[PDB]
Amino acid sequence: GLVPRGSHMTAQTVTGAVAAAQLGATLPHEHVIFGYPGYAGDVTLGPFDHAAALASCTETARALLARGIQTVVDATPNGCGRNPAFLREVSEATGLQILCATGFYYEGGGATTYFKFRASLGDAESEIYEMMRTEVTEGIAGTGIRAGVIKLASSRDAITPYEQLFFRAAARVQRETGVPIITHTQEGQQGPQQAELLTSLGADPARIMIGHMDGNTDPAYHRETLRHGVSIAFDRIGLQGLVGTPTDAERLSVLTTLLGEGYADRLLLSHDSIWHWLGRPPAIPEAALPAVKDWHPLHISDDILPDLRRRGITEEQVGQMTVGNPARLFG
Amino acid sequence: GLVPRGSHMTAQTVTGAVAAAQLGATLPHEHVIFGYPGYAGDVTLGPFDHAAALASCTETARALLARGIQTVVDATPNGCGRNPAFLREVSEATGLQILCATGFYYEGGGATTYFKFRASLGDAESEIYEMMRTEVTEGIAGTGIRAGVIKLASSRDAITPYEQLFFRAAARVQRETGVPIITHTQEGQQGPQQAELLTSLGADPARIMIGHMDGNTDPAYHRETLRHGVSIAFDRIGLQGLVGTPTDAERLSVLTTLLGEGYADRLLLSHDSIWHWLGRPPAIPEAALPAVKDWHPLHISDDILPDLRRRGITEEQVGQMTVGNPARLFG
Ligand SMILES: [Co+2]
Ligand SMILES: [Co+2]
Ligand SMILES: [Co+2]
Ligand SMILES: [Co+2]
Ligand code: NA
Ligand code: NA
Ligand code: NA
Ligand code: NA
Ligand code: NA
Ligand code: NA
């Protein structure tokens, strides 16, 4: 198959390097804690309850370990609450391995004023490249905790000039270190584009995972993204009917077709779940209850995998998506 | 003249209440420390140097006190680096009185994802009202440090539906507590609108200061804002040629005309200066040097006031803008 080619480090979780073989079954895109940019501005009424958060998260972590999931990739952008030290707390308490990211969110949902501004004053791309490179080879906020992946995100209608500063910095870093890249696609679009862009910028397709691909239901769109030899991820499984987002029945339709055409080695599955919100706890409006009912990290282990298997998917296919793939991609 | 009418507390600086008579000459809109939303995401390479920052800021503070300026209103939005405890450090070290704000920035330069999101899920206006009310009557992040003013900001083309959530919350709070409101106008527009809106929402025009009014050079625009009986502020004096922003020569042209028509009691003067940047220190491109040369907090005391006086402005007019007005408005 296609093996990563070029410089390579070692999967750097928030508690240290780990050999690819030790990653085990993995959820490639989740969020232990998250907060939309501005949550910090609601600190007075939406303060972080460390004790409550640490207890809640370790609880969830132990439930994953109970299901054989040994590793989780936390994809929280630098502006969206990323807290390595805490993540490390959760990891050290449970034994769950967690990698964290480096990067900012798409123009519309990230804390974009800062670099959008620096961009007008100078070489922001280079500045972003330096931050990424440092966070992936030395550590974050000087804690010694390195990022295990670079997270990129784009908007619906295009990968904006601001978002591209980040794709270029990432490519530089991916080329230089071999670190993996996971991405966020907005409302099921730009998947092929990020693939064309990253590969054209020289980033290794074998270390690239185009995210939120379940956000699109036309399998032609997936087949086109996969042409670039990158991995794609149905990573919001469980979130049904919010922000474009299709139903799982729909996601599984596509998946069984792609699996049916031999794409097992390029497909990963996650929830993009949030275990503990930062800011004021979200007020889930009555009509939205069903949309998020299966939007938790135990959904794939308990509902999805059994559903694929009983449909014809093999134990080997499930094993390739949940263990094989994360192994080669982050390992 | 027009005196504040309705409930009223006491000017709440970051070190306690202070009688209006004790405010002295004041700079109604400055920023001891600031950071565009996202600066926190650049923590690894743009970390906060407390010692260096505390030394730099107290230095600046002492320079203001040396010029008779006894009070500064820090207008930093909740997402833009607001740090009451630190502000209090600077105040306690020098004796400079500082009030801090409560509020978020305009849709385009603030950390707007959070509430723009909560807005779609529920009654964000009410949530924002609660935060504001608490921060102005009880304190911020539970530190006991209360906000002395509510800061509102709008965009260039309109006061957006998101920005209006904030104008409505503020109005509620202004009506209920009597706390002052200072605002940010984008690229010299919406001044009359914020005035129409706030007053129509029942906020006291005698506790309202429409900001960044020097951003517009047509005095017809000022005269129309002033019709609502609110105060207007040429509060970016010193920033010349960046983000619309006119030249001081131009700002003074308008000012001497407004002063010439008897508007002394409704005009305030500030710099919207930043004493210490949060994040990676800003890279000032060669061509921009002149634009920010006079963009520091000693500019009005040393250059502006002497310029007005030598033009015909009286010691009493200068005294009304720099001492009288802040006294009634924040006192
Ligand atoms: Co995403
Ligand atoms: Co996510
Ligand atoms: Co402003
Ligand atoms: Co300002
Ligand atoms: Na558990
Ligand atoms: Na971000
Ligand atoms: Na793969
Ligand atoms: Na000094
Ligand atoms: Na803000
Ligand atoms: Na006034």
Q: Which residue out of B114, B128, B280 would a mutagenesis test of the A interface target, given it has the greatest number of A Cβ atoms within 10 Å?
A: B114
Residues A178/A6, Cβ–Cβ less than 8 Å: yes
| Residue among B38, B82, B114 minimizing CB distance to A113 | B38
Instruction: Among 3.65.10.10, 3.30.70.20, 3.10.20.30, 3.20.20.140, name the CATH number for the domain at A1-331.
Output: 3.20.20.140
Whole-number Å distance between alpha carbons of A247 and A295: 11
Contact A283 B122 (CB under 8 A): yes
Detail the residues of B annotated as belonging to a binding site for Zn(2+). Answer: 29, 31, 151, 184, 212, 272
- Does A49 appear as a known binding residue? no
Ligand 2 centroid to B123 CA: how many Å? Answer: 25
Label the pairing between strands A231-234 and B274-277. Answer: unpaired
Question: How many of the other CB atoms lie within 10 Å of CB of B43?
Answer: 18
| Amino acid code (one letter) for B189 | Q
Whole-number Å distance between alpha carbons of B273 and B294: 10
Shortest Cα–Cα distance, B284 to chain A (Å): 7
Whole-number Å distance between alpha carbons of B56 and B48: 13
Whole-number Å distance between alpha carbons of B206 and A88: 52
Question: How many of the other CB atoms lie within 10 Å of CB of B80?
Answer: 26
Q: What's the maximum distance between 2 C-alpha atoms anywhere in chain B?
A: 57
Q: Which helix (H) or strand (E) holds A269?
A: strand A267-269
Whole-number Å distance between alpha carbons of A202 and A11: 21
Q: Which one-letter DSSP state was computed for residue B264?
A: G
Q: How remote is the C-alpha of A128 from its chain's centroid?
A: 19
Helices (H) and strands (E) in chain B, counts: 13, 12
Q: Where do breaks (C to N over 2.5 Å) occur in chain A, by preceding residue number?
A: none
Shortest Cα–Cα distance, A59 to chain B (Å): 26
Question: How many of the other CB atoms lie within 10 Å of CB of B257?
Answer: 13
Contact B131 A40 (CB under 8 A): no
HEC per residue, B96-149: CEEECEECCCCCCCCCCHHHHHHHHHCCHHHHHHHHHHHHHHCCCCCCCCCCCE
- In chain B, residues with a C-beta closer than 8 Å to the C-beta of A78 are 38, 40-43
Experimental method: X-ray
Q: CA of A322: how far to CAs of A65, A235, A267, in Å?
A: 14, 12, 9
| Amino acid code (one letter) for A43 | V
Resolution (A): 2.4
- In chain B, residues with a C-beta closer than 8 Å to the C-beta of A37 are 37-38, 79, 111-114
The DSSP secondary structure of B136-204, one letter per residue, reads: HHT-STTSS---SEEEEE--SS---HHHHHHHHHHHHHHHHH---EEEE-SSS-SHHHHHHHHHHTT--
DSSP β-bridge partners for residue B72: B27, B98
Q: Which one-letter DSSP state was computed for residue B265?
A: G
DSSP β-bridge partners for residue A234: A269
Shortest Cα–Cα distance, B122 to chain A (Å): 7
Among the bound ligands, the one closest to the CA of B57: 8
Ligand 7 centroid to A145 CA: how many Å? Answer: 25
Residues A279/B115, Cβ–Cβ less than 8 Å: no
- Does A151 appear as a known binding residue? yes
Shortest Cα–Cα distance, A129 to chain B (Å): 11
Residue with tokens 């990963």: A268
Which residues, including other chains, have CB under 8 Å from residue A165's CB and lie 6 or more apart?
Answer: A115, A119, A124, A125, A128
**Among A117, A108, A196, which Cα is nearest to A153's?**
A108
Ligand 9 centroid to B269 CA: how many Å? Answer: 23
Q: CA of B48: how far to CAs of A81, A83, A121, A225, B142, in Å?
A: 17, 17, 21, 41, 22
Whole-number Å distance between alpha carbons of A53 and B324: 50
Residues B330/B23, Cβ–Cβ less than 8 Å: yes
Provide the residues around ligand 1 (an ion) whose CB is within 5 A. Answer: A 184
For residue A313 the two structure tokens come to 């998917």
Contact B47 A141 (CB under 8 A): yes
- In chain A, residues with a C-beta closer than 8 Å to the C-beta of B42 are 78, 114-115, 127, 131
Which residues, including other chains, have CB under 8 Å from residue A116's CB and lie 6 or more apart?
Answer: A107, A162, B38
DSSP β-bridge partners for residue A210: A232
Shortest Cα–Cα distance, A2 to chain B (Å): 34
Helix axes B124-137, B161-177, angle to 10 degrees: 40
For residue A113 the two structure tokens come to 């004023």
Ligand 9 centroid to B131 CA: how many Å? Answer: 13
Residues B331/B278, Cβ–Cβ less than 8 Å: no
